[PDB]
């Protein structure tokens, strides 16, 4: 539902990939003519970097425990 | 095998509990011995082949009596006999080896038709 | 008694020691150039 609005805005590709690579603000300010919120940049960086998202007796038991213990537009949902 | 098969066909699709429990105990006891070529002895090998035939009858008959129910434990056991080839390979003169492999591959085919049914 | 005989017909945990068979077909030697007690048992003519 939301992508066409993103393609409506023009600088989105540049700033997002720069957010992907965590570029320093100095390189951003060299060729981008609109102010970019630094505290937003750090926050998105922090969210981006968030990462919270005997051998024969076992065969008889596991074959019972894994095969008898009955466990009751493309995928694009990774 | 003959008695339980007549037992299963008699109570076909009618459902019950005592028969199911008895078959559950029988399949639980006979399951570990299934497809176990421990001491490669033909007297043993012929006996355990009958064990394979017997355990094929018990699972079929157990499925017969509980037909169309979607039972859990009956599904639990038949899932077991479904999976894992077991047998001589894994864990638990050219035409001759062909026939030697032919016997084992045919045994797996017969073991599969029962669990599939 | 019913349970104990079924255990005799169906020994579940009693039989299987380790389940470690070699599963290869044993080959019997028929040569008559070596003299042994076992060979003499199976080979008669000498």
UniProtKB/Swiss-Prot annotation, chain A:
<comment type="subunit">
    <text>The APC/C is composed of at least 13 subunits that stay tightly associated throughout the cell cycle: APC1, APC2, APC4, APC5, APC9, APC11, CDC16, CDC23, CDC26, CDC27, DOC1, MND2 and SWM1. APC2 interacts directly with APC11 thereby anchoring APC11 to the core complex.</text>
</comment>
<comment type="function">
    <text>Component of the anaphase promoting complex/cyclosome (APC/C), a cell cycle-regulated E3 ubiquitin-protein ligase complex that controls progression through mitosis and the G1 phase of the cell cycle. The APC/C is thought to confer substrate specificity and, in the presence of ubiquitin-conjugating E2 enzymes, it catalyzes the formation of protein-ubiquitin conjugates that are subsequently degraded by the 26S proteasome.</text>
</comment>
<comment type="similarity">
    <text>Belongs to the cullin family.</text>
</comment>
<protein>
    <recommendedName>
        <fullName>Anaphase-promoting complex subunit 2</fullName>
    </recommendedName>
</protein>
Swiss-Prot record, chain B:
<comment type="similarity">
    <text>Belongs to the APC1 family.</text>
</comment>
<comment type="function">
    <text>Component of the anaphase promoting complex/cyclosome (APC/C), a cell cycle-regulated E3 ubiquitin-protein ligase complex that controls progression through mitosis and the G1 phase of the cell cycle. The APC/C is thought to confer substrate specificity and, in the presence of ubiquitin-conjugating E2 enzymes, it catalyzes the formation of protein-ubiquitin conjugates that are subsequently degraded by the 26S proteasome.</text>
</comment>
<protein>
    <recommendedName>
        <fullName>Anaphase-promoting complex subunit 1</fullName>
    </recommendedName>
</protein>
<comment type="subunit">
    <text>The APC/C is composed of at least 13 subunits that stay tightly associated throughout the cell cycle: APC1, APC2, APC4, APC5, APC9, APC11, CDC16, CDC23, CDC26, CDC27, DOC1, MND2 and SWM1. APC1 interacts directly with MND2.</text>
</comment>
Curated annotation (Swiss-Prot), chain C:
<comment type="function">
    <text>Component of the anaphase promoting complex/cyclosome (APC/C), a cell cycle-regulated E3 ubiquitin-protein ligase complex that controls progression through mitosis and the G1 phase of the cell cycle. The APC/C is thought to confer substrate specificity and, in the presence of ubiquitin-conjugating E2 enzymes, it catalyzes the formation of protein-ubiquitin conjugates that are subsequently degraded by the 26S proteasome.</text>
</comment>
<comment type="subunit">
    <text>The APC/C is composed of at least 13 subunits that stay tightly associated throughout the cell cycle: APC1, APC2, APC4, APC5, APC9, APC11, CDC16, CDC23, CDC26, CDC27, DOC1, MND2 and SWM1.</text>
</comment>
<protein>
    <recommendedName>
        <fullName>Anaphase-promoting complex subunit DOC1</fullName>
    </recommendedName>
</protein>
<comment type="similarity">
    <text>Belongs to the APC10 family.</text>
</comment>
